[PDB]
Symmetry: C3
Subunit: 332 residues, 3 copies
């Protein structure tokens, strides 16, 4: 009887940050209430000033990470304001039935809906828009995110012992297919609808023009680099709603990795690089052992360094010469 369960309202935060939550559940099952507003907006995605009409949940690419526990209910109020031009919906890969909710959440501009579903399987899962007949256009315009369903007793290692993270970040990776003219220059459009047939042709090449973290080339660099300290335990949730990726922490490892994101399985240990299939979220746990700059990349290095799938960590603390040292510095 759901009416007797506690309700808790969560205010979401912008990726790559994650809303406050408890790893080990401090309450019984709850109805966890979220609200998201759909925003179609112009986004500049590279250093050249290339602009697309992005389709977003809550104004960001990716959409925000939602965090609940196994056997909580998720109640999502989804709002499509009348300033938008398209029909949207939402499909949760965490959910059972009705196309993940897509069949029940079709909202025209000026409409809203509220969906509830039970989070029966623990793991990180993709959510994305999926309107009939226009599914990849919405997804590849940025309309995807992820949801994490923690076990009620938190994460465990391969021997069943607790794993506790100190920090968590969410990296959404996005493949974009920006249409090009005859000579290879990117086209611009006044409205999302203008782009539609050119977008289909661009997608059918299967060759993205940009692959980015957090919605733009260089988004997770500089003042927006991810941070940690030596000794900190960090969980990085990574999603890709449409196309395979292979994350790698340059200078580190994935100590414990759930490449396909489902926590009832034991983690893979000591990974250099792992494959997250398109339409999946995964999670990697690492304890930092050295300070400095790290690069976190899709290790198709062309995708990383030419097309945009690279971010940075900046790590503070003490250098350990036992792990690595320069014996003879570069010299003639």
């Amino acid at each position: 009887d759901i009416s007797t369960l506690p309700r808790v309202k969560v205010d979401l935060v912008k990726p790559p940050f994650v809303h406050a939550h408890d790893q080990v559940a401090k309450t019984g099952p709850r109805v966890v209430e979220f609200t998201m507003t759909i925003e179609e907006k112009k986004l500049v995605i590279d250093r050249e000033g290339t602009e697309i009409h992005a389709m977003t949940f809550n104004g960001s690419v990716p959409g925000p990470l939602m965090v609940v526990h196994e056997n909580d209910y998720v109640e999502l109020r989804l709002i499509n304001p009348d300033t938008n031009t398209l029909l949207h919906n939402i499909d949760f890969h965490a959910a059972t039935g009705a196309l993940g909710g897509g069949a029940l959440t079709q909202v025209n501009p000026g409409e809203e809906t509220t969906l509830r579903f039970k989070a029966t399987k623990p793991g990180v899962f993709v959510y994305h828009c999926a309107p009939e007949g226009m599914v990849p256009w919405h997804v590849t315009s940025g309309m995807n995110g992820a949801i994490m369903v923690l076990p009620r007793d938190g994460l465990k290692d391969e021997k069943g012992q607790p794993l506790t993270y100190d920090k968590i970040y969410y990296v959404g990776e996005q493949d974009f297919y920006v249409p090009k003219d005859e000579a290879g220059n990117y086209k611009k459009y006044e409205t999302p609808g203008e782009a539609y047939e050119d977008a289909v042709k661009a997608m059918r090449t299967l060759t993205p023009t940009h692959i980015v973290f957090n919605g733009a080339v260089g988004a997770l660099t500089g003042d927006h680099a991810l941070t940690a300290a030596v000794g900190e335990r960090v969980l990085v949730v990574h999603s890709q709603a449409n196309r395979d990726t292979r994350p790698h922490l340059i200078g580190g490892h994935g100590d414990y990795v759930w490449a396909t994101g489902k926590f009832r399985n034991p983690p893979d240990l000591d990974q250099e690089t792992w494959l997250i299939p398109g339409g999946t979220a995964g999670a990697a746990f690492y304890t930092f052992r050295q300070p400095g700059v790290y690069a976190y990349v899709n290790h198709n290095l062309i995708e990383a360094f030419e097309l945009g799938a690279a971010g940075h960590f900046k790590v503070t603390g003490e250098w350990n010469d036992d792990l690595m040292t320069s014996v003879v510095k570069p010299a003639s």
Copy 2:
């Protein structure tokens, strides 16, 4: 001494259906006899009427699923009628030696051969044609299928407890590379041989023009949707002889998944999406919990919804509001 073993003749059925078999072996090891006839035929693969010269085992794309038990012998009579134009052979990834049988089964039109091999490893495995110098042309013209070698005691979960399926379906996924003229229109040819150099050039782009289930866009929809009932346990065998895929049941999960298809390994649990590498068969087990339409897709959504890699399940039964419900239907 093989001459003292029982022989049993199996009549194959057209995908996505699977011939009758027992999950737990009710006899000792047997010689299991199959016959396949090669048929080169014209196939219409999309709604626009695009036609290719397909190369098939038993008239279908994919070829039929063969089912035996571990340590059975498979004896295959392979017939290449004189109405065909090409040399063909067969390579079983389940088999040990002679290029999987390919070296021993080269049949010109008007020839036949009989191969026997012992099924020593349990799992689902690809089989495909592989003639010297023309391997990817035959495979990507549809000349592939799969074989399932069940353990003698059936399937088991990750704790070693029995898993019994109620229904089984076989989804063969096919990448096609239809040659195009200067403007992007598909070419037509009178005979398979006419297409050969244009086919090589089309394949070398690494970009399929169509990716389909059961040989055509929309093949597993409408009257040919897959069916199940709420509460039924369904095993879906999925193969891809040449190119990676990432299956996903929209509105469901893979409860138990052998992504690379080999049953001595524990299944992965609770998968949203899984990667089947090209040249592999995998298997996913799901118990339906909600009625309605489900879409089963390759979750590169461009590959699914633009290029053809999508099918439907239609599921009968009772709706469970505890798992999902619309709290407020879409409204202004």
Copy 3:
């Protein structure tokens, strides 16, 4: 205190062979000293005579396999002779900190450096060049290899029992992106630097022109086929520094496979084909059961048979008719 540990100097050998080592450690932890010389050289990569300016560690593509044990120290003297034209460095995915060593090993032509790192995680790992701003160009010009860190007690199966190999081979798989003119012909350049902007444009297509084992189409065939005997236990280490691959032994299996290459995890059993993600090394163990020719391929068969990712094993010994036999040889 490192100064009290034994030092041992290893002389590397050319792939696909591997330097002598012990599987089970016969000494305590050591400092293992390697020297590598960088060589930029012209390489002919196909039967048509296509030439690239390759960037190599020790004159080969791939670079040589280094073998140590867990908790050894690796000390690498890296030499960039003044006959080269470019800055180079090295990044070990086995190492912790400083971008895998890349930040500490930048050598202009005429310089050398010595790096030491502790091998704290067992597995096979990629190493590659990664200079700031030119990472994929160096990697996709051949500047990558692998390092194997064995557990001190050797390899184990999924039940923790020892696995001992009789022979080991290293297959480096390389994606090349040779620039093309308007009509599709490959361009030639006097120096590596001439090619740079054309190389960037070629890489951004994400479509390799060649995918090869051991640096050229057909490198592991003929007199250079890999050899084994029936009954021999063979470990094949396979790396791909940039792009996914899916190895398959035609006529065999991977009996025990570490697809993502990390030995603290149990192997996957009985694999037909396995996925090694780009930026990863994996390892497969097989016991040969039949003599004859085997093909070892990337099982995207277009990549294998059209673009070059195929090699051969030639296996001596006795044929076993119980496993496979021709019952009726091909006939009219």
